[PDB]
Design a protein around this ligand. Structure first.
Ligand SMILES: [Mg+2]
Ligand SMILES: [Mg+2]
Ligand SMILES: [Mg+2]
Ligand SMILES: [Mg+2]
Ligand SMILES: [Mg+2]
Ligand SMILES: [Mg+2]
Ligand SMILES: [Mg+2]
Ligand SMILES: [Mg+2]
Ligand SMILES: [Mg+2]
Ligand SMILES: [Mg+2]
Ligand SMILES: [Mg+2]
Ligand SMILES: [Mg+2]
Ligand SMILES: [Mg+2]
Ligand SMILES: [Mg+2]
Ligand SMILES: [Mg+2]
Ligand SMILES: [Mg+2]
Ligand SMILES: [Mg+2]
Ligand SMILES: [Mg+2]
Ligand SMILES: [Mg+2]
Ligand SMILES: [Mg+2]
Ligand SMILES: [Mg+2]
Ligand SMILES: [Mg+2]
Ligand SMILES: [Mg+2]
Ligand SMILES: [Mg+2]
Ligand SMILES: [Mg+2]
Ligand SMILES: [Mg+2]
Ligand SMILES: [Mg+2]
Ligand SMILES: [Mg+2]
Ligand SMILES: [Mg+2]
Ligand SMILES: [Mg+2]
Ligand SMILES: [Mg+2]
Ligand SMILES: [Mg+2]
Ligand SMILES: [Mg+2]
Ligand SMILES: [Mg+2]
Ligand SMILES: [Mg+2]
Ligand SMILES: [Mg+2]
Ligand SMILES: [Mg+2]
Ligand SMILES: [Mg+2]
Lengths: 52, 128, 187, 147
RNA sequence: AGGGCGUGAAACCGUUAAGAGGUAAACGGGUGGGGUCCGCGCAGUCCGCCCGGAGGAUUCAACCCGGCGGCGCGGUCCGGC
RNA sequence: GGGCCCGGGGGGCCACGCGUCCCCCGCGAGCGCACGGGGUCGGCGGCGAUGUCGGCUACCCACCCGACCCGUCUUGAAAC
RNA sequence: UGGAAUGCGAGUGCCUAGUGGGCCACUUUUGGUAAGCAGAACUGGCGCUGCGGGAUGAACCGAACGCCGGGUUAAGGCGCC
RNA sequence: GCCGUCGCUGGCAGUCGGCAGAGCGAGAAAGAGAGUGGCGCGGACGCUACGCCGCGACGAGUAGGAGGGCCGCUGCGGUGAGCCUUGAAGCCUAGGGCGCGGGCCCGGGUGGAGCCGCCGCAGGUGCAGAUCUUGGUGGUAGUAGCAAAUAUUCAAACGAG
């Protein structure tokens, strides 16, 4: 129920949103993996530019 | 022959009985530890005559004699000789109480060093 | 019993800064002494403004400080603000100022000094103006905050120019009924 | 932290701060924004005038890049160039005015709020307001249009 | 710690000891009597200065040598950062 | 009666230097007692090592006054 | 000569819970034979509130409450309880 | 008398000492002002200023709000040259005390291996109730009861029976 002055809010939480929460606790491990694949690729094509 | 404090004012206690919790005499499940009664019909809460009393700041003890031991001192827990030597300059108003879990061996050092510094020990004859 | 009411006994006001800042409290120690031991009402005002909250200490822009220090008879007076002096890009010429503030932004500092002015702290105002003599105490706009656009008669009452709380701004967001006669009504 | 919150102080107090009479029931009044035109009508009318109804034309497939047009007032115009740009122009004698290109600074339209310093300037922009051009012309400057 | 054995609570029960018992018990306030223990009581404090008796010494002040430290508007000393 | 209780011919005064002009006609020293900014005695007595001293509260018992069982919904609960 | 008496420091802004079953008494008062009935006005109460008195009691009378000593009272009382 | 709350948005940085001079509570504005001419070596406490001190008024409370807890529980970062097999936690206690209280300290006993104080951080953090959950135990109570379908007896044997 509304109470005095306030914004009218329409949160989109009327589905089963907890079944589809994507946490990011693997973010640092993803960043390491991506970097480790950039290094092994830079070694693989050297002296060709790493960027591409 | 015991050490005496700087002054020994008369200690006045407004109340000496403990405040037993309501209905704690009727059940073992109700410990006598105080709990503010909060029932709607609770007659102790409403301060009916002849009922259990409720604690309130009015019973407070005189600021001067508060926390004062009957000896006229105020206790201070110590665990070793080093902690004892913080009472060197306030030995006429504060005494040393040695913690329960100090080994009997070490109580000899604290009880000895306290004698040298004229600091009073509340429990010197323990764990002999 | 005494027929009296107690709801108003306790006055709601600050006796100290909510902040745990140690430099602020060292200044409060300083001005607690000056306020007590000197009859200078200025010290009491400054002492009080040191307790105030962040929104009660609005920042004072350079342009506003220049305007108020240009009024007749305020020459060589030290401008005093219990708060921050923010730079104003809209200002072109910055006159020589002497100022005392809690904070001065990095760009406001360069402009004041490059104009030849002097910036003080509040511990330096005491050694220069112990009673606050020759001072011009100044304050930032207290109602210059977005919140006060939302205070007053509720937006849905006649002649109320209060700002509503909307998640979005646009044609579809609270403009149909109650805001134009063609849709129900207007007030 | 949960140690600083009301729940810790409400231990031992029946009702947990929601009253003995009204209690804390699940959803009295409805869920969400239920009742706007009904038992909750005063709150909506009082605090959200305009909430109900429709106004104005629809526009399918709005692309907000088509109406990109950041604006700058004249009182901020001289910040788009370094300080020495202005002082050099003010003190030089040949009469040469600097070029301020507002598109390079990320603006398209020039608005008229404020006053300019008495210093000629050539301004480049996609759009001008009528008062912007007059004020720019009052100091001896010119308005240059870019596509 | 005796093979569902670390510790071993409460309810509830046996027994030993003490006290009490016809308005169920329990409870608040106020005293009183009796117990368990505690004061590790039972000729009652300690300190400063002073007076006087007995004594006794790494013997006081003041001076000299050496070291250390504080301050100096050294009215304005030299060197330094 | 009021006019520092106007002016003239035994009992209390928070009167007591003087040059004057004239209305009118800037510091004495001490000492002491106290109905004086909240109690002191520069006053005393008895008892005290094996049965006696102190121990609020605390254990048991007794008596006098008080005293209905809590939580809850309720205008109202000790509620049959 | 701040232009009656009396008393008192005022103003102002945000955020805000619980409530939205009430009930009782003097006086006034509608319906009803009336009701410890239903419905209103004013004020004060009970609810949320103990305490002295009315033996007993939500509201009656007195008086409202920090923990205490002394004194005096209110309403009520003073054969005995 | 004492406790607390509120108010005085009250007082104290002046502990200004022999490089000295002790005051500013007092009916009634503003200087215990600055000048120029006419023997001893001595003097209590204080001030965690988030501290300390003074004076005056006041103190009912459901629903509800707020403050402070040197109230209590579990874990984390610091710290306590912390405690502990000369005995930790836990548990028991007609032992001694402290606090208005939430609680806490110490003595004794049991126990046998770990625990706690302070500054911060975090929370699955405080039970009398929910015909609450699971487990244990009472009174009832040596009680109801061991009663449907006719029935047992004598002697001996084994056997502690
Ligand atoms: Mg609501
Ligand atoms: Mg809100
Ligand atoms: Mg009630
Ligand atoms: Mg009162
Ligand atoms: Mg109140
Ligand atoms: Mg209030
Ligand atoms: Mg409450
Ligand atoms: Mg409820
Ligand atoms: Mg609430
Ligand atoms: Mg509700
Ligand atoms: Mg809810
Ligand atoms: Mg064992
Ligand atoms: Mg083992
Ligand atoms: Mg086991
Ligand atoms: Mg076992
Ligand atoms: Mg037993
Ligand atoms: Mg017996
Ligand atoms: Mg009786
Ligand atoms: Mg009875
Ligand atoms: Mg109920
Ligand atoms: Mg009913
Ligand atoms: Mg009840
Ligand atoms: Mg009944
Ligand atoms: Mg309701
Ligand atoms: Mg009625
Ligand atoms: Mg009815
Ligand atoms: Mg109610
Ligand atoms: Mg009320
Ligand atoms: Mg009442
Ligand atoms: Mg009667
Ligand atoms: Mg009395
Ligand atoms: Mg009678
Ligand atoms: Mg209260
Ligand atoms: Mg027990
Ligand atoms: Mg083991
Ligand atoms: Mg946990
Ligand atoms: Mg339980
Ligand atoms: Mg039978």
């Amino acid at each position: 129920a509304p109470s005095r002055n306030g914004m009218i809010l329409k949160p989109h939480f009327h589905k089963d949103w907890q079944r589809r929460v994507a946490t990011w606790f693997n973010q640092p491990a993803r960043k390491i993996r991506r970097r480790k694949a950039r290094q092994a690729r830079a070694r693989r094509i050297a002296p060709r530019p790493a960027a591409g | 022959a015991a050490l005496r404090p700087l002054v020994k004012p008369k200690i006045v206690k407004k109340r000496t009985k403990k405040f037993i919790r309501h209905q704690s005499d009727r059940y073992v499940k109700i410990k006598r530890n105080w709990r503010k009664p909060r029932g709607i019909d609770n007659r102790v809460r409403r301060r009916f005559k002849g009922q259990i009393l409720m604690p309130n700041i009015g019973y407070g003890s005189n600021k001067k004699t508060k926390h004062m031991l009957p000896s006229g001192f105020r206790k201070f827990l110590v665990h070793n000789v080093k902690e004892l030597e913080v009472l060197l300059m306030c030995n006429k108003s504060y005494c040393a109480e040695i913690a329960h879990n100090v080994s009997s061996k070490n109580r000899k050092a604290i009880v000895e060093r306290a004698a040298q510094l004229a600091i009073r020990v509340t429990n010197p004859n323990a764990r002999l | 019993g005494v027929d009296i009411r107690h709801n108003k006994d306790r006055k709601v006001r600050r006796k100290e800064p909510k902040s745990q800042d140690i430099y602020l409290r060292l200044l409060v120690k300083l001005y607690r002494f000056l306020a007590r031991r000197t009859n200078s009402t200025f010290n009491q005002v400054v002492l009080k403004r040191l307790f105030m909250s962040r929104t009660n200490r609005p920042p004072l822009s350079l342009s506003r400080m220049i305007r108020k220090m240009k009024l007749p008879g305020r020459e060589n007076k030290t401008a005093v603000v219990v708060g921050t002096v923010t730079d104003d890009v809209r200002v072109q010429e910055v006159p020589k100022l002497k100022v005392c503030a809690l904070r001065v932004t990095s760009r406001a500092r360069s402009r004041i000094l490059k104009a030849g002015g002097k910036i003080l702290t509040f511990d330096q105002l005491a050694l220069d103006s112990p009673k606050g003599r020759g001072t011009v105490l100044l304050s930032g706009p207290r109602k210059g905050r977005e919140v006060y656009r939302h205070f007053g008669k509720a937006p849905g009452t006649p002649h109320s120019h209060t700002k509503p709380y909307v998640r979005s701004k646009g044609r579809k967001f609270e403009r149909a009924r109650g805001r134009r006669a063609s849709r129900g009504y207007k007030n | 932290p949960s140690r600083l919150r009301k729940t810790r102080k409400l231990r031992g107090h029946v009702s947990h701060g929601h009253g003995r009479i009204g209690k804390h029931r699940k959803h009295p009044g409805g869920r969400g924004n239920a009742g706007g035109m009904h038992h909750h009508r005063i709150n909506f009318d009082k605090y959200h005038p305009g909430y109900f109804g429709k106004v104005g034309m629809r526009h399918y497939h709005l692309k907000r890049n088509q109406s990109f047009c950041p604006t700058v007032n004249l009182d901020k115009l001289w910040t788009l160039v370094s300080e020495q740009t202005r002082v050099n122009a003010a003190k030089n004698k040949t009469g040469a005015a600097p070029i301020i290109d507002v598109v390079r600074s990320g603006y398209y339209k020039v608005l008229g709020k404020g006053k300019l310093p008495k210093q000629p300037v050539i301004v480049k922009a996609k759009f001008f307001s009528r008062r912007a051009e007059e004020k720019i012309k009052g100091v001896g400057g010119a308005c240059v249009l870019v596509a």
